[PDB]
Paper text:
Four mature saposins (SapA, SapB, SapC, and SapD) result from proteolysis of the precursor prosaposin as it traffics to the lysosome. The saposin family members are disulfide-linked, four-helix bundles that usually form dimers. SapB presents a variety of ligands to several lysosomal hydrolases, including arylsulfatase A, β-galactosidase (GLB1), and α-galactosidase A (GLA). One cargo, globotriaosylceramide (Gb3), is presented exclusively by SapB to GLA for removal of the terminal α-galactose, and failure of this process leads to accumulation of Gb3 in the lysosome and ultimately results in Fabry disease.
While crystals of SapB:GLA complexes did not readily form in the presence of the lipid, we did isolate diffraction-quality crystals of a SapB:GLA complex in the presence of DDAO detergent. The structure of SapB bound to GLA contains a dimer of GLA and monomer of SapB in the asymmetric unit. However, the SapB monomer lies on a crystallographic two-fold axis, generating a symmetry-related SapB pair of monomers resting in the concave architecture of a pair of GLA dimers. The SapB pair is proximal to all four active sites of GLA, and the two SapB monomers do not contact each other. One SapB monomer rests asymmetrically across the GLA homodimer, contacting each of the two domains of a GLA monomer. The complex interface contains backbone and side-chain hydrogen bonds and salt bridges, involving Asp231, Asp233, Lys237, Lys240, and Asp244 on GLA and Arg19, His64, Gln66, and Glu69 on SapB. In contrast, the hairpin of SapB, which lies near the active site disulfide bond (Cys142-Cys172) of GLA, interacts largely via van der Waals interactions, with one hydrogen bond between Pro41 on SapB and Tyr173 on GLA. We aligned the SapB:Gb3-NBD structure to SapB in the GLA complex. This alignment demonstrated that both a 14° narrowing of the SapB hinge angle and a 19 Å separation of the SapB dimer were necessary to form the SapB pair in the SapB:GLA crystal.
Residue numbers in the entry:
A (entry chain A): 32 to 426
B (entry chain B): 32 to 427
C (entry chain C): 4 to 78
Amino acid sequence: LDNGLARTPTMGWLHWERFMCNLDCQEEPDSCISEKLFMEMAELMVSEGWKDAGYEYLCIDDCWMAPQRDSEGRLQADPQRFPHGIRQLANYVHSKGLKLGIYADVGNKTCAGFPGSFGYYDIDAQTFADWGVDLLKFAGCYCDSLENLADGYKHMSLALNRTGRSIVYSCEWPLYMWPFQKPNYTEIRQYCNHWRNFADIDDSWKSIKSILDWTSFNQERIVDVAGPGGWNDPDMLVIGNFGLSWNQQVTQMALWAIMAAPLFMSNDLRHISPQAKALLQDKDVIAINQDPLGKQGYQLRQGDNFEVWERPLSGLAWAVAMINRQEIGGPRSYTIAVASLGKGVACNPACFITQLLPVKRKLGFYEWTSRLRSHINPTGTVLLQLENTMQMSLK
Amino acid sequence: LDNGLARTPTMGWLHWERFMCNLDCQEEPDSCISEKLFMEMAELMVSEGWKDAGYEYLCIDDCWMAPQRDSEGRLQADPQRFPHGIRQLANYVHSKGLKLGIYADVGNKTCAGFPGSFGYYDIDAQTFADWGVDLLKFAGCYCDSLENLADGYKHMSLALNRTGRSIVYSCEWPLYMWPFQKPNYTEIRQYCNHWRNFADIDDSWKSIKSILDWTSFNQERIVDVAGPGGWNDPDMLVIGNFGLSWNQQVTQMALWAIMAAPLFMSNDLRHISPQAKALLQDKDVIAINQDPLGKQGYQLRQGDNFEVWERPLSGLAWAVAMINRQEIGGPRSYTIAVASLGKGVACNPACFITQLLPVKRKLGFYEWTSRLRSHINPTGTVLLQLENTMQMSLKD
Amino acid sequence: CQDCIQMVTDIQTAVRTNSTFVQALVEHVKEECDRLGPGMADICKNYISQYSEIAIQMMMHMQPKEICALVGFCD
Ligand SMILES: *[C@@H]1O[C@H](CO)[C@@H](O[C@@H]2O[C@H](CO)[C@@H](O[C@@H]3O[C@H](CO[C@H]4O[C@H](CO)[C@@H](O)[C@H](O)[C@@H]4O)[C@@H](O)[C@H](O[C@H]4O[C@H](CO)[C@@H](O)[C@H](O)[C@@H]4O)[C@@H]3O)[C@H](O)[C@H]2NC(C)=O)[C@H](O)[C@H]1NC(C)=O
Ligand SMILES: *[C@@H]1O[C@H](CO[C@@H]2O[C@@H](C)[C@@H](O)[C@@H](O)[C@@H]2O)[C@@H](O[C@@H]2O[C@H](CO)[C@@H](O[C@@H]3O[C@H](CO)[C@@H](O)[C@H](O[C@H]4O[C@H](CO)[C@@H](O)[C@H](O)[C@@H]4O)[C@@H]3O)[C@H](O)[C@H]2NC(C)=O)[C@H](O)[C@H]1NC(C)=O
Ligand SMILES: *[C@@H]1O[C@H](CO)[C@@H](O[C@@H]2O[C@H](CO)[C@@H](O[C@@H]3O[C@H](CO)[C@@H](O)[C@H](O[C@H]4O[C@H](CO)[C@@H](O)[C@H](O)[C@@H]4O)[C@@H]3O)[C@H](O)[C@H]2NC(C)=O)[C@H](O)[C@H]1NC(C)=O
Ligand SMILES: *[C@@H]1O[C@H](CO)[C@@H](O[C@@H]2O[C@H](CO)[C@@H](O[C@@H]3O[C@H](CO)[C@@H](O)[C@H](O[C@H]4O[C@H](CO)[C@@H](O)[C@H](O)[C@@H]4O)[C@@H]3O)[C@H](O)[C@H]2NC(C)=O)[C@H](O)[C@H]1NC(C)=O
Ligand SMILES: *[C@@H]1O[C@H](CO)[C@@H](O[C@@H]2O[C@H](CO)[C@@H](O)[C@H](O)[C@H]2NC(C)=O)[C@H](O)[C@H]1NC(C)=O
Ligand SMILES: *[C@@H]1O[C@H](CO)[C@@H](O)[C@H](O)[C@H]1NC(C)=O
């Protein structure tokens, strides 16, 4: 979308994978969906360096609404779970230096059953603008025709523009049309800031595998569409949760850095391991994600349960990720000629290679005819940064 | 098998999941299938307290043999990867106070193309017994017929009885019998110490899911067969590897304690996390698995992505595992009436409940009409031990 | 329900060995495209030349009981 926003991929926090639709504040007050949760999250986003690392958008997913609209036809928050209102929450998030997001749907209803924005596009866009909301995650549940889907997404895209407020417009437009339509992503880039491609992520290595395989299969149609202002959204980061190994978390962080992905956390910042915090606040990996050139990486090759991905970086640099997809055994050795990396120009005539994940170490200079050998853990990813001749005469 | 062995489930160490068939010892000498690997594994099984927990059987899986037999028709190891021989390696294992295991096959070849033992059952049986072998894993790759499979397994069992040495005989009989015929588990219990039922494990949570689902489906066939002497082998333990989370490792340890399963580790003892060491050396969980009553646990309840398993223990004690199979969200609460546990007699009229996994804490006394409430992490398991009115001065 | 679980465990196991019978399975379903009659046969062959390497990968991640539940054999 040509709104001057999402020039780098959007970084922040979303509550759906960790907290879901928890409406029981009587028995579980610390985990139900309330403004207390988001205010504690906004405190920890500054107090733990999440704001310093680049995460800024404290977004809200489903199950924030009252079951009915008000007498004026506007959306209203739940009186028990959000008594002080969305606008006061937005002011508290802006007072902490962060930005606040919110959720809505093109359909009659949202995905949980809360009221959607069909027939109320201008009204709800103005409501989120008056509340001070800086990001919209606009879902596509309970939509009856794809014409209604496309017209609702375009109507909200123009209606948020008519508010005059800078907003981030996250779409689920190609999410609910892939079983029966090939999406024309030029339209989706024209009307959205980033778009959800494949199905919803969960706390499993299965979802990481399926999302990466679907992205690598359709990479001829979605890579060149991605740029500053429009990104491919492979849902949320699930690092810091219950159902991923450490190598699988490293795989998700490295491949989200390669795919120019919007790094939306879904964890509990009150209860997070220091290792997941150090992985999610890695400077040299977020720098790959927030590369100012903003060109999405792609799968270079696959075979022998090995995947090699590369992303062009700004300033004659490249980012190379290698995945061992073999889920049996130990650290497997992989050797690749660096003349095949970066269309033959990434190491012409010499490139310095610095491994960033799973550990930060330097691997010395490699000439054009040289071969790079590394060891990759199963269900793990070795991510590396490659320089070129554009370096000082000091080494 | 009335050999006097495997009265408790067998504890030890196999190599197939972590090291597989690495034969390139020039490029990777530390991680190839050589006697240096097993010597270092025995040294760390003594030095790191793995023996003191209960793991003793340092076993060898496939890819140890020479590509051809010798001039006497006997099996022989690889002369480069095993320069000193199997007998000297077994002496090194016995010098540390451990026991050594080895692998063979009922077919013409093993699963890696190495020579099998079809028509060589007695010869290789006396060869292993003279080398000092205390455990045999017998596979079923490259076997032509079910009659040949059954007769070869019976022949190997009778030959290992004829040697006279105390050898724990592990079989892959119902693993290869199930795709064509319903296995007769009384016969398998008659001839084997423990038998592999489902396919080979890998470093994934999906394999744990499929093994547990298959065990819960066929639990009316394989639970009452299991006792002292005869166990059901799911597969090797994979705790300490690259592909499981902490809660999935907790799930595997608690459920292998519930299922009266053999605890064969398959990891790197040179590179293991302290959390995996503390989980694999949990005294109360191993005491649940090594319970002298020998009755295999069973799935009590399944619903709403929740799984309740229970195992009867000695002294009227019970072990209860609760699994949250929902792989999205945070921890989920679960409340169950304790009168539904242990066929109604586990907490009659009262019972003390002690959580053991994922953390050890005392939950206090619960009556017969009481309801137990708990919280389970996603892909995780809460493991509990319950004692009835068979306790004194611990009741105050 | 359960017969599907046995058959899908068999199909998942047969490529867990990395035998590359993916080509054999694609050739089998391309042969099954001739069951639709001469009109839709080459339509099925065009729709199975693409979208078949990826779909078996989604089925390879998927649990076999989940495959049976999603196609309607169990839930
Ligand atoms: C080759 O195969 C044969 C055939 O099975 C084996 O022979 C068996 O060996 C076991 C050895 O453990 C024998 O079992 C033991 O019997 C002892 C008493 O003998 C008689 O006792 C009563 C009648 O008085 C009968 O019920 C019994 O069958 C015998 O007639 C018991 O005291 C032993 O119990 C001790 O060990 C067990 C572990 O097995 C513990 O659980 C107990 O608590 C206790 O400590 C034991 O039960 C068995 O009788 C033999 N059977 C036959 C037919 O000979 C060979 O051992 C085997 N050889 C090799 C090398 O594998
Ligand atoms: C939000 O919901 C409204 C309707 O509300 C819900 O639907 C009703 C069925 C009923 O259950 C209500 O109680 C409930 O709240 C949706 O609006 C409907 O949109 C459809 C679009 O397909 C309209 O159907 C069309 O109506 C035309 C005349 O009004 C008629 O000419 C059309 O017929 C042609 O097309 C059909 C193809 O479906 C074909 O079969 C015919 O032969 C012919 O070619 C067609 O019937 C409904 O009339 C609309 N309902 C109302 C009350 O206006 C709305 O789409 C939905 N929004 C989203 C995003 O899902
Ligand atoms: C509603 O939609 C309209 C589109 O029809 C949109 O108007 C666009 O606004 C952006 C403002 O961000 C304009 O982009 C600028 O164009 C000027 C040239 O005219 C450039 O100088 C600007 O470049 C600077 O800023 C960039 C960051 O955005 C930097 O990357 C750059 O290096 C410079 O520092 C900038 O590109 C754009 O031209 C218009 N488009 C049109 C057709 O007028 C409007 O903003 C939308 N309104 C809302 C509320 O969303
Ligand atoms: C290891 O490899 C050896 C060598 O291949 C193998 O031994 C062979 O087993 C086959 C079993 O099919 C034997 O073939 C049989 O031979 C007898 C005569 O000796 C025939 O009567 C049999 O014919 C009947 O069965 C056929 C089906 O197989 C029918 O088609 C036919 O009409 C008859 O009903 C049958 O041909 C063969 O003789 C041996 N060869 C030797 C040298 O022993 C052994 O089985 C393999 N072991 C394992 C574990 O796989
Ligand atoms: C996606 O669809 C749109 C149509 O909505 C295509 O845009 C059209 O491009 C032609 C260029 O020849 C223009 O004349 C039309 O005016 C455009 N339509 C609109 C509504 O503006 C677009 O080309 C399609 N994307 C791709 C990649 O083909
Ligand atoms: C299984 O084997 C035992 C002994 O070998 C026998 O008594 C029993 O009848 C067999 N079961 C069946 C179903 O034939």
